[PDB]
Amino acid sequence: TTDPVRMYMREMGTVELLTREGEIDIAKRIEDGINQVQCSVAEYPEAITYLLEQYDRVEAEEARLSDLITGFVDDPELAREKFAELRAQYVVTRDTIKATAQEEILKLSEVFKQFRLVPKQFDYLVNSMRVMMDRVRTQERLIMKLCVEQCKMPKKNFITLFTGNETSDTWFNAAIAMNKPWSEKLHDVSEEVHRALQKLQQIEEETGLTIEQVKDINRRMSIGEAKARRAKKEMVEANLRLVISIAKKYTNRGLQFLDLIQEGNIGLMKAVDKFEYRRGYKFSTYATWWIRQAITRSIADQARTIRIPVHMIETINKLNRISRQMLQEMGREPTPEELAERMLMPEDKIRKVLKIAKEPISMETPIGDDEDSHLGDFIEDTTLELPLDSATTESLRAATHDVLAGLTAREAKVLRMRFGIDMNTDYTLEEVGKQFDVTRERIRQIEAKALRKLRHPSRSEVLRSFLD
């Protein structure tokens, strides 16, 4: 029926309400998903050393502790000694790679999982990971396209010696002599593949992981991330009805209905993001605060044609409340200074605050006759300059220009200099002294006589008429 209010009401009404048990189900799914990515982050060597390089910048006064960690499971001293533990577990696991290492690589993860990272930092890690995987995909697809598409080799036979290695020369130089139909064709592109293999094998140096593992790890991460959003989305969809129930209170506050319910939906999104079901707090009354918070916080900001800071808004509301009771309490209405004593502040601010708080009047407001004459049609232009004046400006130029030719060439130059007449800016009488080489008092005398010469009327009768 269009009217987008309806096509929403009907689109969400399909989603079935969550049972109190179903809520924990979804919340449980979230925990698994995130813990997967947490564990997946713990399994990246570069992810540890980077955190190390960051704390070494913290102890070197190149950063602050607030810009890196939000705290662990569970103060500068505690932070310092906790980071030492991480560094400790890294330096053992590092040298044990000579098979058995795995048991210690498993413990290095555990300690790292205690760190609750700042969201910005966490995002950068994952970004670094996905960017590293782009770097791997670049080389994977290059070596594939340089063989299959260019040199005409089937992909069926291209993957046999790839899996498990994709670094060393077992596949590239030992498979071209096999005399298969696709074998002898691989020589033309050899120069381009083997030189691009550099970054491919370098990744296992930087990241300290064979190209094998590099895909797996962030694949589980991808899976986990998907699961998280899946569940969280699911949760939000279940509680849309709650948002609707809250926004129906705030309707006429000056924002549209669908505007309200959308802003509230974001609040609900935040509520899911920060919710922990292990606390036993019913999800309804926990999200209500977040949803209600978003609505008001939005209404305060954008609902006005002139944005006002929050504290200003709250001030205004307090006045309405008093004016309500005091309307009938006083039998007339509180005097402009009445609410002033009731309110904390200097109390003369009532006038100022009350003025800027007012909403602008529609310039299209019809006034009179019902005719197309509208308020905006009556607002005159004050920034323009009337022609009856502009004519006198062009004249005054011709005036002073005439009267400055009646003087000596230096009096005109000195007077045109001391004022902005036909020149950029103007020059201080000391500056003028530098241009003429005879300086200080000398110039000032000349100025006096110049103004004096225009004072006694022959010159004077024309310029005096400009001041009325």
Partner: protein
Amino acid sequence: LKAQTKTEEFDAIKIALASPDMIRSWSFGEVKKPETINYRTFKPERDGLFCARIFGPVKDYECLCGKYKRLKHRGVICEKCGVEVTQTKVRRERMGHIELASPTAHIWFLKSLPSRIGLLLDMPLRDIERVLYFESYVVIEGGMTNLERQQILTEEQYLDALEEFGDEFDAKMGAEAIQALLKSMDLEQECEQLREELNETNSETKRKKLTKRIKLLEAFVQSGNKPEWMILTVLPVLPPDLRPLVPLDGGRFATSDLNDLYRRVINRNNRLKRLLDLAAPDIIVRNEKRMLQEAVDALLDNGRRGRAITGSNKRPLKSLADMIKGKQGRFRQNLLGKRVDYSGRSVITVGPYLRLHQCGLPKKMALELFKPFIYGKLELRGLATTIKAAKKMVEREEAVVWDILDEVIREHPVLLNRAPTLHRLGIQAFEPVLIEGKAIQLHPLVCAAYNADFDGDQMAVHVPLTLEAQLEARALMMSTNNILSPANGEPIIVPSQDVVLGLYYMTRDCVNAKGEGMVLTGPKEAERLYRSGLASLHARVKVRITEYEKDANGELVAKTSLKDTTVGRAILWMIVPKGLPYSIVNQALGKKAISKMLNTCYRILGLKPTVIFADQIMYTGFAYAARSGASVGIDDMVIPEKKHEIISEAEAEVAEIQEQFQSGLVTAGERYNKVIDIWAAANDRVSKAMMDNLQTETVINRDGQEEKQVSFNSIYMMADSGARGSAAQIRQLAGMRGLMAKPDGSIIETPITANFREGLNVLQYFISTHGARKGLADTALKTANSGYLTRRLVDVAQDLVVTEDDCGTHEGIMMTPVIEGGDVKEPLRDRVLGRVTAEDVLKPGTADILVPRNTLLHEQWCDLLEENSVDAVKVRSVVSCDTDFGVCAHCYGRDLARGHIINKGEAIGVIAAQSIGEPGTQLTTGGLPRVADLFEARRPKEPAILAEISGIVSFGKETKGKRRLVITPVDGSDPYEEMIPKWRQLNVFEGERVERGDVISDGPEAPHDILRLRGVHAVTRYIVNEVQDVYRLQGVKINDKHIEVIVRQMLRKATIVNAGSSDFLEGEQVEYSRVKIANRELEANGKVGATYSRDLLGITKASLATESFISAASFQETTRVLTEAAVAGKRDELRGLKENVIVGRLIPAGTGYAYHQDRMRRRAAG
């Protein structure tokens, strides 16, 4: 040589769709925030609807931050906050844009009545809307699987189709889908297929829509527009100062609604951007996208969906489409229409002393009006040092300035205007005369053209600033240059009332008066006799007079005689110039004769002698009327002595018929009409009684017993002279007044037996009220209706202007006297006057050409036609003129306020409409609505039917609801058989031959037929003769010319029949077409030329088609016009009037006609 890049003087204009990059070209920055002003310091918040960085400095030549305040620094972009320091004027120009997250539909192309996106994709509207709201999925580029390209799927159905075919099939939903559709669309391929399919199937239902669609497509292809552009990527923002936030008194602010709208569009948009980076669920981002769609739609044109309401105010906020739109079309040039400087206005008074070329102007008004002229003149002679000192002088009102004003006033015409401007005489130029007092004085003779009474009407003044305007005013709009109505050549300067009452009392004669019988040498000593008190103004006297006749060859002959006349006529002769014979002043000089006097004076001596003549007539009329001491007393109204008896006899009649109804001898209805008839006859009886008594009752004595002449009683002289009053109104004063009518329209059978000289009782007055009330109501409403008529007329004509000199066609229409049922309801001499002969006309014998081929027929030539008995003359008309895109002056006529043939370039369309419209106030089937029906071509309710083709006809088949009529031509094929319902009584004889266009029944006939069956000249003759009947019944003189030009515009379009260049059935300009088959008649194809059929369009329908779209957006519905043009990329070349007025350049007519001509040839040339 290189063309240009910077500012030239543009011709034409183009309109089209806007690319996203094209929108970005105008934008000097993206508005990223709903913020307006800082809220304390009211400076604009940066990157907001009001932004110094994006748009412009708040104050002239000053940086926002304030670092660079000096007027020297100009092209500097401030390093702190980038603001190029420039005039604040640039905040009125620079635009902006907004990059929308999701695509958005343009409400104009979605919801315009012929939905553009819909018929471009050949897709229904409801489906397209269903896809925009994410209420269903639509296929795009379906490939070969299961599915149509435009097919729509549901939730489950899309899912099933995807599991079967993963790829090689594609479907989207929402705005992105439609945009994908439009981009994927290949117009060339669709065009070819549609051409074949058109040919294959023959059905009217099928190919009507078919041809409509194909036209759009090839147009859209030729346009240069790419379909994707109907979906908005980038949204332009209007410059801030066009929706200002400007402060008000008391510190409150006021701003345009667009801000409230624009703000909304941003927020929702921004939120959507946020909702993408937050990975929200589908159900939400979908709702947000719809919300964005609603906001954009509401922004562009509000009211086509939900009608969003402005903040805190119930009244819906006005959107951008409503700024252009309005009532009607555009606000700018439509009434009304912009205020104008150098003007004023006030109450008007008489000023009988004025010459006809001048007017009294209040001192104060002229001072404030000419202020710049006065300032410049004061220091040109050196009475003021500088312009300021001059200002102080006039502000001090120093005595010396008044003489300087006499200089700037002397030769400097001013424009005077009255409230209901109808014909061009509603504005006239005068020479200003400085007058003490605050009232405008207006020459009495002009009071007729303005329809300006003195009961307090106010008039407006305009100063002609530019030199060309002074000379236009003096040579065009001047009072003395228009003395004649453009509607008919009769003088509109005709003396009004007091003046003609003077001349009537002047030349008149009683039976015996002082000086009767004596003789005088000449008019000089005649006045000497009168003024000295010896002789009475009217007495029969022989005096020697010298008259003149120019009957020689360009030479005035003189002849003297003793004329038998009166003293007054003798005195009056002093004014009559030269070549007029004394016969003209020897009569009683009523208002009718006194007009033909001035007319002849104009057609003989020319313009200049007539003017000074007219002045003198006014002066003497007022003067002598004052001497006369005419008055009106209560004893001036003479009631018949026999009235009471007449009432009684008629009173017996009613009781006789009543006695017949009581006894059943007569029916109730028959009684009513009868009684009503006897009372009516009685009124006539009383009227022609008091008229006899009142008219002649002066009975006076010369040397004998008695004699009787026309009465000198005051009120008769008024009515007789033609000054004021008429037999109808007089009848109401003395004799009984009428039989009034009860509200339902019936007429009460007990008339008003009393009159105004006697008293009316309670009932009689109360019954009188309805007539008064209906009178006032009818006029007050019909006044507005008349105006409406002129509106449609000037719209349908307008751009028609005299262009060529002689188109050189022998064609024309046959002008005969109207000869209606009696003798000559209007003569031949009036019908042919001032027109041009189509071909030479014969005497009764031949090889004798009286009037030779095309010659202006003036007063002598028309009298030469009257000398001979010639009853019929064929005359060139504007309807037959061969000139394309205009009328040749040779085909029009002479008519103007001047007697010369119409000049090259005068705009006849306007004056045609004005001439028809101005008298429309006096009209009341029949009346003013009858005229409107005629010009609208409307087919009547129960029309007649004309024989489709000549030859013997007969009746065939039987009664199905139509009893077929079968026509049988002699030589040609029979097959024409028309289905006529037989329950309408026929006329056509079943056994007789009827010519095509004969009467097959009775009743009115649709002029469409008359055009089709009888021909062009026939229908134009029908219109002019019928409409002229309507007007002439009311006594309105309107020359047939004007009606003919409207007619020509009625037939502007025709529908092609044959082919070989353009489309079969297209209605199109006969100008374009005829010029196209005349070009084809030679060169090109040997002859491929196509046959057309002239069409008849009603006035309101014919005005619809105008090449220039800027004109159409004015008086039509703005929204549809802009869209329908924007798709085709139509390029408006101006060339017309309406459009040139909007853009504010010289009208391509009159004084401007030289300009456009000179430019038009420079164009499309080297």
